[PDB]
Amino acid sequence: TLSAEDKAAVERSKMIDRNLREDGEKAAREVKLLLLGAGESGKNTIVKQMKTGIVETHFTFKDLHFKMFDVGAQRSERKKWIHCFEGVTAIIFCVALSDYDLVLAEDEEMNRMHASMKLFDSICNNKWFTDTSIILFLNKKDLFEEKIKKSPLTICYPEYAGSNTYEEAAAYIQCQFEDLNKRKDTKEIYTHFTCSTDTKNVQFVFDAVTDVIIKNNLKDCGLF
Amino acid sequence: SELDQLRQEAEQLKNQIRDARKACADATLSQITNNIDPVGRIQMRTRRTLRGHLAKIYAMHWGTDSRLLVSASQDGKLIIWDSYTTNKVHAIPLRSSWVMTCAYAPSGNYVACGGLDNICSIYNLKTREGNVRVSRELAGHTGYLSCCRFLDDNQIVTSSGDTTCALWDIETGQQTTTFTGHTGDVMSLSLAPDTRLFVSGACDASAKLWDVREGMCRQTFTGHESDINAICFFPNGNAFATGSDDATCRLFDLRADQELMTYSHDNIICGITSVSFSKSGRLLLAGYDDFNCNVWDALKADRAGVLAGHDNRVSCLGVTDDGMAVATGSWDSFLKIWNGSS
Amino acid sequence: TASIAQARKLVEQLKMEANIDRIKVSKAAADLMAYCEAHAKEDPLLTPVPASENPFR
Amino acid sequence: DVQLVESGGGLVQPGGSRKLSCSASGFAFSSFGMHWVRQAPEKGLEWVAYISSGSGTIYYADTVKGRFTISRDDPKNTLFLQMTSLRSEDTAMYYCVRSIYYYGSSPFDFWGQGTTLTVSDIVMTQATSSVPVTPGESVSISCRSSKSLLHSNGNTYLYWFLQRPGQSPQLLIYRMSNLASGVPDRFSGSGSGTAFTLTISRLEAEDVGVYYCMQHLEYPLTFGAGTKLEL
């Protein structure tokens, strides 16, 4: 009982739905990664290795399209816009290992490594990312090794009582971030040690993302 | 010395304002509206369900014809709906998918949106080419865009998370006036019916009344305990209501320059996302994080009814200009149109 | 000297807000109640209209 | 700029076949439904065919159904009209008309220049063939319909077109009251039920031409005879 114009109006709407449904299928098959980190923590370097208010970077690796969102320019409250990323495939967190004996320029009393731990704890334990995997990157490996020879790790972690070598000091720092995981059941953390001349940084993300895809498939298929 | 003396004078001025507001608090809004009868139970049914958004809906705005509405979702789609038939009139693909606000021009010729990209994009709906195109991108805010409202086809006001609101000249693309004074992220703004003033609510738990033409803050309203997320002018322009994360709605008066009434319930412990008034102003509709929309009696602070039709957080709502229906958008990716029956 | 400059501006703003004319809350409350009474009949959500006049039947 | 150029017309033998093309430039062709409308020499307008956006819906006039085929090529922005078994009744100028349909749209807003072909139902009535007019004086044009054009949704699907001598038709009034974009406000459309009036206040030299009233309540779309204004 619709007029000739309204029939084309309804037909036009069905034309729009055919395009909205088409885009929904394409947008659900792409990987959305939220990139976080601290100041001068290698967060900007990862973008250069995987090449306003928010910076969005796209790259495709092995028939998988990755959407990486950089939110380093948002100086406002994090808790207001953080829920906008609820549902990202994984979170890439950059931590500078060499920044263990350094302190914040403004605070002048808070250790730079401890600032990353507080930021990681606020994101890993965040309610919006309850079941979101974290791809933890520990950058500046070479600089950390050189500084550990002169500056002991005990300055950053007084409780550390291990050998003054990279093979034992770095592993202690890795366990500290993983110990901050308040939910060791619904998520896993993929820790990788990158460098300024490394070339496997993107490969680690793809494998880490693949495991996240498998975990979601198991949940959907009912096996998990 | 001088700095210490100046900050002491600010406290004296704040105490002077607080005493002045207390002096004129002769009666309470509850006492004034005690005699009037309650609105009863407000039962509204979902007349229409707008489907097609595939992600969380963050904003909606009715057109002035009370028939067309625009909704924004973070699937990167701005959709214009014919609410009578649920037909989609337009589907605007957004350059940035992280949209947080949307506005319908009062003339109906333009829509606006913007989010974490710090840009307010203006889209022309009436082009000879038959498609919606970007006519202006308003850059200049250094934080996320939380709200935007057209005054006419050439002027729009935007609030940002960089603690400032701005008035923009769309034709030149420059902000003619900048409204500064908030110490936190401004989350919402509402235009007065005459479009000469507007109020904004920020995350410093304060609401400021701004003069559009003069460009300064006329009055500041405090009383909330957490970030204000929503704000809406009373239909006569002499009052406004806010919604905050402290699970409360408060009715502030411009001329009395103080809070008049609080709209909260003990079961409600979640934040408020959106607020709106009915055409007569007797009903205050507020959206909540607990997936529901509560209809309040504005005068008597009684929960008149509940709109429970969403499976996620009600992120936005709006009442038509004629008052015929209310639309609610939600993170469950659906919009619903509600009205009552005799 | 950023803090001292900001302090003068904040104090100056509070002077403007303290010099406004304020009416009694009873006067302001009555006007809001009066507006609702005058426009009550033309509010479809408050008083639902007959189904014949409702575009969303 | 928006352009619609038709081609393929010319002198053909009776019973032959001819292919008409309408190339669209300057607007989103795939978003618009397209019509072919013809006008026999010294006659009124006659609707031929319609193809919707997305090619899902196709309508034909009864006098040409089965012989004419209308098609579109969205990537090339070309509209086609395949004609077969051409008769002497098909001698006309064929116009390409764009029309988009959504709430508040203005269908039939842009017409093509037309191509000339020479071969070797609601009734819309405009009884007044000609009206002598003088500049600056108000003129009213009347149209009648066999059926009521007012639909139950409140729209009255009546359209007004003006074809100045030597020019393609232009939309003046759509849905019986609304004024098309780019048309001076002096034109006003008034009607009720089956009787409609087009009022032209302060007539000017440009307004001289033939005026057609069209119904869009249902297919086939039918035109009135037309009222000519002459000085």
Added chain:
Amino acid sequence: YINIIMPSVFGTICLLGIIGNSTVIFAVVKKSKLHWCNNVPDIFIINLSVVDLLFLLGMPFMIHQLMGNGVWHFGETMCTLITAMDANSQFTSTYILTAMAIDRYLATVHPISSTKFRKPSVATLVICLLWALSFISITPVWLYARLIPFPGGAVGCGIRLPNPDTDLYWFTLYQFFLAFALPFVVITAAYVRILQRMTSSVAPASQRSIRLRTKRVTRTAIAICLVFFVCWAPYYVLQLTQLSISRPTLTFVYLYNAAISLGYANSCLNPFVYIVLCETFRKRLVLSV
């Protein structure tokens, strides 16, 4: 006691299976917001419960000819239809279960390349194709479903082969191959590959989360194969055993009837395995309720 024990087992299975399958259908439909399902795993699970529901609704009309008198009171027209309907449900449920294991195999072993064709539209086409293959597979069932005149005044519905001396062999193997033998190999092989390809090298196997993932998938993949094997092997073992046996005894008759109950128990435990062993679905069901 035997005359009451057998109906009690069938009655308990019939009621429990319907409740389990109805819960699965109810949860998936509610999850779909009263619309066509947009997830491939959701399409298979509701269709599997639909076939199981059909296989259970026809149980009372198929067991009353076994406990009370063994007399078919519905005539030849219903005898051919019900036997064909019952055979179709047995084949369709196994085919859906077998195809669902391949879908889970694709979603895990090939998580990247399978997104091209693991669409809701493709899932609907395959399931509709499973029913079509089920009708073709049950072609001998309804072509040879004729009334068998038993001695005395009582008759019973059954399969009356034209050459029971020789045709009894191929008919038994054909049901064994398509319904038990071939699908079990596919289902078992699919899930063992899942357990061997569910976690990558980069995944922190030392973390408790990954160790918990492997533990839950292991007890779900094995349980699905274990239920399918146990609920059908004795029914088909006796089906093959009765080829050599000419005169069945009372114990053999009781075991065969018990084997029938296990066959209907397959459609009773499948919805419960999905509900119990899938914490993700269990939480969503609680969330929906």
